[PDB]
Design an enzyme around this catalytic site. Structure first.
Site, short mmCIF file in Angstrom:
data_model
loop_
_atom_site.label_atom_id
_atom_site.label_comp_id
_atom_site.label_asym_id
_atom_site.label_seq_id
_atom_site.Cartn_x
_atom_site.Cartn_y
_atom_site.Cartn_z
N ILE A 18 31.42 -5.67 -2.92
CA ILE A 18 30.62 -4.65 -2.25
C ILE A 18 30.34 -3.42 -3.13
O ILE A 18 29.44 -2.64 -2.84
CB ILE A 18 31.25 -4.20 -0.91
CG1 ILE A 18 32.69 -3.70 -1.10
CG2 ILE A 18 31.20 -5.36 0.08
CD1 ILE A 18 33.35 -3.21 0.17
N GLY A 19 31.11 -3.25 -4.20
CA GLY A 19 30.94 -2.09 -5.06
C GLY A 19 31.47 -2.30 -6.46
O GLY A 19 32.17 -3.28 -6.74
N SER A 20 31.11 -1.38 -7.35
CA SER A 20 31.60 -1.40 -8.73
C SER A 20 31.38 -0.06 -9.44
O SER A 20 30.69 0.83 -8.94
CB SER A 20 30.93 -2.52 -9.53
OG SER A 20 29.65 -2.11 -10.00
N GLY A 21 31.99 0.06 -10.62
CA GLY A 21 31.84 1.22 -11.49
C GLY A 21 32.21 0.84 -12.91
O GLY A 21 32.09 -0.33 -13.30
N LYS A 25 36.02 -2.44 -9.50
CA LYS A 25 35.28 -3.30 -8.58
C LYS A 25 35.88 -3.16 -7.19
O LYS A 25 37.08 -2.94 -7.04
CB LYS A 25 35.35 -4.75 -9.05
CG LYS A 25 34.89 -4.95 -10.50
CD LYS A 25 34.71 -6.43 -10.87
CE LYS A 25 36.03 -7.15 -11.09
NZ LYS A 25 35.85 -8.58 -11.53
N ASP A 134 33.95 18.01 -5.64
CA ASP A 134 32.85 17.10 -5.95
C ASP A 134 32.36 16.34 -4.70
O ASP A 134 32.02 15.16 -4.78
CB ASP A 134 33.29 16.12 -7.04
CG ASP A 134 32.13 15.48 -7.78
OD1 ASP A 134 31.24 16.21 -8.27
OD2 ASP A 134 32.11 14.23 -7.89
#
Length: 257
Positions: A18-21, A25, A134
């Protein structure tokens, strides 16, 4: 077709990613009983000691602070070695940013309830000495119609806007008031469909506009006059004059009806 992750003995089957960077993951996974979770994987093999310290620090705070508020994402368990981190967390529907991007307008009741949640999670981290610094919509996950803070801004490193950045962060080039501004910018976006300085496309100018007291922020008249007042209170450039989170929790916007 059916890959698995193990965390503290327990096997989890991956439903989808569903996500990553940057080497991180996020997976939707099911446990033995077919209960859904989000597993955040982090690869540590290029992380320096400073980076590692910040990661452990955020894991530690997430682990402690979740007992103090249910508007903080649940960390059920984690496995941490020299090579990787796996974090088993509660699964949500969608993050606030993605939901906002595909929403023509927000229901006034949903907006107020999301605001309450956001104030509650941010108040909690503040009570334990953490200033996020942030905040954006992407930092909140919608779970069972409820906003949950998924991180505390402690992590070092692995797009990215300055639309939510407060003026004192730019002039000082930082306190719990800094988070109030950014929450203000999120609410403003939920109210007027854009953030206060979104129209300025040159980032340098945008930064200049954010710190410029002669640049007046627009607050178009809306039915909810208490909402309008909250926005004006959060977006005061002077942090001393800016409203606090406890002040916001007693505001008629969150209290009355």
């Amino acid at each position: 077709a059916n890959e698995c992750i193990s965390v503290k003995g327990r096997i989890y089957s991956i439903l989808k990613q569903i996500g990553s960077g940057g080497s991180s993951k996020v997976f939707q996974v099911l446990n033995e009983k077919k209960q859904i979770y989000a597993i955040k994987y982090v690869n540590l093999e290029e992380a320096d000691n400073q980076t590692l310290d910040s990661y452990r620090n955020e894991i530690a705070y997430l682990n402690k602070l979740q007992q103090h508020s249910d508007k903080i994402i649940r960390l059920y368990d984690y496995e941490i070695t020299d090579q990787y981190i796996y974090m088993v967390m509660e699964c949500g529907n969608i993050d606030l940013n993605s939901w906002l991007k595909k929403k023509k307008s927000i229901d006034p009741w949903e907006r107020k309830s999301y605001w309450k949640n956001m104030l509650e999670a941010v108040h909690t981290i503040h009570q334990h000495g953490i200033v996020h610094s942030d905040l954006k919509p992407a930092n909140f996950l919608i779970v069972d119609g409820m906003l949950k803070l998924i991180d505390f801004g402690i992590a070092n490193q692995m797009v990215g806007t300055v639309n939510y950045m407060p003026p004192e962060a730019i002039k000082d080039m930082i306190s719990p008031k800094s988070d109030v501004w950014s929450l203000g910018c999120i609410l403003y976006y939920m109210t007027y469909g854009k953030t206060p300085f979104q129209q300025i496309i040159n980032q340098i100018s945008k930064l200049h506009a954010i710190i410029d007291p002669n640049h007046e922020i627009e607050f178009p008249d809306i039915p909810e006059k208490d909402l309008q007042d909250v926005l004006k209170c959060c977006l005061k450039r002077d942090p001393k004059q800016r409203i606090s989170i406890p002040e916001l929790l007693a505001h008629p916007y969150v209290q009355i009806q």
